[PDB]
Design a protein around this ligand. Structure first.
Ligand SMILES: Nc1ncnc2c1ncn2[C@@H]1O[C@H](COP(=O)(O)OP(=O)(O)O)[C@@H](O)[C@H]1O
Ligand SMILES: Nc1ncnc2c1ncn2[C@@H]1O[C@H](COP(=O)(O)OP(=O)(O)O)[C@@H](O)[C@H]1O
Ligand SMILES: Nc1ncnc2c1ncn2[C@@H]1O[C@H](COP(=O)(O)OP(=O)(O)O)[C@@H](O)[C@H]1O
Lengths: 55, 375, 375, 375
């Protein structure tokens, strides 16, 4: 029972960790898309400056 | 004793045989791959003494027996002894036999052809199995691990294969066959324990050492730090009681033996080590494959039970691998028993029911059929 | 999902296929013009796995696939692969069955006749489209770019067509079709990346080089001065992330490849380059046409997406052109999508509804009807 | 020991180094491209024993050495071992000190730039050679074969460059570089010999398999029919004497090894074979060139010595080629030694005496000079 609870707790940890990792992958994918959105925003804003400058 | 009309599964190596029936998640029993024979002439009447001992009988009576192992670095050469082992396994102890069930046996991907030919032949001709299927250990290792993609580190008794699979396909040029496994680690430990004053020469002694290793030894996350302390202080030693009343303690030898996997030069082997062979099985695959294999490094077989191996192999590969990317090792409780489990999965999958050789096709074609029907 | 029988529009090249519906301003989906096939032997079972993969399926599973495209230098030679691409495009991503929607496909003005004829046949016989119309890519480029007059510089994956149009009329004697394209740039870049120590010889590697080119390469305005510093310092290098976490840095190769457009001899082509070729299309037109073509050089297609290309082309053309005359380049953001967009426009215009081949006229005449009804 | 200050020629392949002096018709000596190192702990005192062995020393003492090749797929990465090989080659065995002789080295045209730059740097800075010239294998092969025009398909140990030349001119857009060479053919053979019960995994074993291959293997002009009988009977097997008194015979493995030249998929490469690359190098050249390259298909490099290769390659191209055209293979006994011979021819031509970099220009410019003065 300690061992089964352990396999279950270890599984919970494995799956929770699988999700710590899946979440970190999504966080980094989203943070990367965010940083990229912000790089692309800074670019869009710089290109906006070029467009306004063009205006 | 069983009434489930399913396939039977066995993983047969140079040390142990795992066996049970397909559809379950574990072997029913594990037997030594041993046919034991007396090494002494009996004198007294009423002392028993068999002409031969099989599996666990041979191991239990080993103090007075010579123990023969039929499998040489993954290949069965002594088919007669394996037939005895299989009879005992199936008929006497698992209480289920091939005569009434399809049977799946395993081998390494580059195992010499004669092995799969004899495994197929013995089940059909001496056990009268209705059907056969010789499986690839790499396939089974990933099924049992929940993967279609990954590196299989199948560290067995006589050979470590190191073989990648991607999306269910083999990547054979990236296989790093290695002549280092659990039996070589046992032989090395016998020699370094001899250095400590406890010589081990006989096969019964080899079995004592294998027991010491399995309970006392580890690889270490950081070899040099454990070594420097263990080689300098008794605080790193662990005791084992030998079956004669002596007590043996082991210090840096406790990890130097297991270290051989990372440093094969310890036993005179020409090899880069298990972590570089793992790295090359990933690196020799195409660049849109490499990333998935790095993230899916899968342990199977035994030796995977050494403390520090799942953490160390991940450390050694991530240290060689590029940054940002996640490197992960899969090392479940099914460690060392996962090949058998994979065999159960493959044998029972509905997607596999057309892969079986029936005792129709076999009888007309002969054992060469294994190359037409299995792989 | 549409509330009207709007025409379906697809722009199919040797690179990618852009598809969507008439009346929109962008494709609903973009696919590589690829059908992928596994190049490895399956080892595991119950893995799914297709005989062939199409479009994005082929790209997502590319690690083990050889990827082939049906279109060479603007012409479909493998209609079976285009049929698969179109079925996927229309039914899975656009979510439409062509049976209830007329379809507009495109080709270059001097594209061999078999292209427009086979495209017409497949949409009428395998998709049962109610009507067909094969458009001129140059027409579509002019609508999308806001012109009736100018030189269409598509410089695509297949060919650069260089075609002058005045007041919406072809000036075909002045079309300078040129065998200089985006697919040759991909090939050139990998040869110079080989010089740097990075080998790109497999399909996955080829597509990676294409991706490197698209994100890192440029033409700039002065090759020799740009090379003088790019060849002397790491300060002009840019890192590209390879899928396995490793990187490649690219230096003067970053522009030496794109330079091929101005110097076609880099890929063994007998040509003066795109600026002179554009100039010649203008010079082969009457002098009362030339003034409007000089002032309206219009970029479409792809490769026109290299930094410095609109500005270098204006410089290189004005340098060949007579003085007094104003030379200008139109290079809209509708780059790479403008031919598809023009397709959407031609299909949505009321001025085009009489131009369709119906699935009546088609069966009475056969697919050769396309040469009487389209252009 | 020479009586004239002739140039030296040294053909440093990924396999072996052929070397001698310019103007001759053969290398004076052949050394492996190997530096060997002991993989064992010394037991006896006063035994001499080197830290590293070079060339023929490395093979002579190989029983306990791991043998490494400084050159991988044609490119030098370990310049220190190259310097050791060159010092031994030039000063101990060929008896030509480079300080008194100009030196010519060889390489594929797409061999990454570091190769030609590092080789030039070492001969000028560690050997003080008065002049240098790094030559291209395609040039060298046509000179050796008596041609100005033809396809050079160098099926050597490292990488195959497949380069067409017409009237002395490179036709670079038609170069098909393939990541398949003799070293991979050997590796394939080792895996299939393992399948037959002969496992070769250490250096001594690897060098032996290469020797077995060289004496026993052939291409077969019909793989499937040859395999049908090779796999069925001992009548198509050939024996080899192993150094330890054991023997090996080879059956279909005898031809399956070279078959990888026609089927690169055997080692995991995405390629249709050396005859498709040869075909494409002819086909991608101008239409008035194609006829001359079909009639002048030049086999070069090693592996050209597998029986039947000269004929199978003519058959394979003829099968792809248009009718009317004459397809012909050039395959002199000067095979495998053709690059060295071309070096001898080229180094001594009056037409080449202006191509040498002197050790003046070298120091003013540095080793990067090779990219301006040689190729
Ligand atoms: N606790 C352990 N510590 C160290 N090594 C182990 C341990 N358990 C298993 N191994 C090793 O693995 C071997 C058995 O694993 P296994 O992979 O199931 O062999 P096989 O594939 O031939 O059936 C043993 O010989 C032992 O040397
Ligand atoms: N930034 C870029 N740099 C270099 N080449 C580009 C860039 N963008 C587009 N191209 C190239 O243009 C081609 C796509 O042109 P496209 O007009 O969309 O094909 P199609 O005519 O069939 O619609 C590809 O070869 C692509 O690599
Ligand atoms: N009879 C033969 N059979 C098979 N392969 C051969 C034979 N002779 C030579 N080769 C192979 O060719 C390679 C030698 O490459 P080589 O062309 O000589 O490079 P280099 O021009 O620099 O000397 C080795 O892999 C060798 O085993």
């Amino acid at each position: 029972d300690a061992q089964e609870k352990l396999e279950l707790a270890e599984k919970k940890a494995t799956d929770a960790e699988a999700d710590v990792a899946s979440l970190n992958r999504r966080i980094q994918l989203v943070e990367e898309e965010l940083d990229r959105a912000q790089e692309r925003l800074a670019t869009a804003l710089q290109k906006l400056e070029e467009a306004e400058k063009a205006a | 004793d069983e009434d489930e009309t399913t396939a039977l599964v066995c993983d047969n190596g140079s040390g142990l045989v795992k066996a049970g029936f397909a559809g379950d998640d574990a072997p029913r029993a594990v037997f030594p791959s041993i046919v034991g024979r007396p090494r002494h002439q009996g004198v007294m009447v009423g002392m028993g003494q068999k002409d031969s001992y099989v599996g666990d009988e041979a191991q239990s009576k080993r103090g007075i027996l010579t123990l023969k192992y039929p499998i040489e670095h993954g290949i069965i050469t002594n088919w007669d002894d394996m037939e005895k082992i299989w009879h005992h396994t199936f008929y006497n102890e698992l209480r289920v036999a091939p005569e009434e069930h399809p049977t799946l046996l395993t081998e390494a991907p580059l195992n010499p052809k004669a092995n799969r030919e004899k495994m197929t032949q013995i089940m059909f001709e001496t056990f009268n199995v209705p059907a056969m299927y010789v499986a690839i250990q790499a396939v089974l290792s990933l099924y049992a691990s929940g993967r279609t993609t990954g590196i299989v580190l199948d560290s067995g008794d006589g050979v470590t294969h190191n073989v990648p699979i991607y999306e269910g396909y083999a990547l054979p040029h990236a296989i790093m066959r290695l002549d280092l496994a659990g039996r070589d680690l046992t032989d090395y430990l016998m020699k370094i324990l001899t250095e400590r004053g406890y010589s081990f020469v006989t096969t019964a002694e080899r079995e004592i050492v294998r027991d010491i290793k399995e309970k006392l030894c580890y690889v270490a996350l950081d070899f040099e730090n454990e070594m420097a302390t263990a080689a300098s202080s008794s605080s790193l030693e662990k005791s084992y009681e030998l079956p004669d009343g002596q007590v043996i303690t082991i210090g840096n030898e406790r990890f130097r033996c297991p270290e051989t996997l990372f440093q094969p030069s310890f036993i005179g082997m020409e090899s880069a080590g298990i972590h570089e062979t793992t790295y090359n099985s990933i690196m020799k695959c195409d660049i849109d494959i490499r990333k998935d294999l790095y993230a899916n490094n899968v342990m199977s077989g035994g030796t995977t039970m050494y403390p520090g191996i799942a953490d160390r192999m991940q450390k050694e590969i991530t240290a060689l691998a590029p940054s940002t990317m996640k490197i992960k090792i899969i090392a479940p409780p099914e460690r060392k028993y996962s090949v058998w489990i994979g065999g159960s999965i493959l044998a029972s999958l509905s997607t596999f029911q057309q892969m079986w050789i029936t005792k129709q096709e076999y009888d007309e074609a002969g054992p060469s059929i294994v190359h037409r029907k299995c792989f």
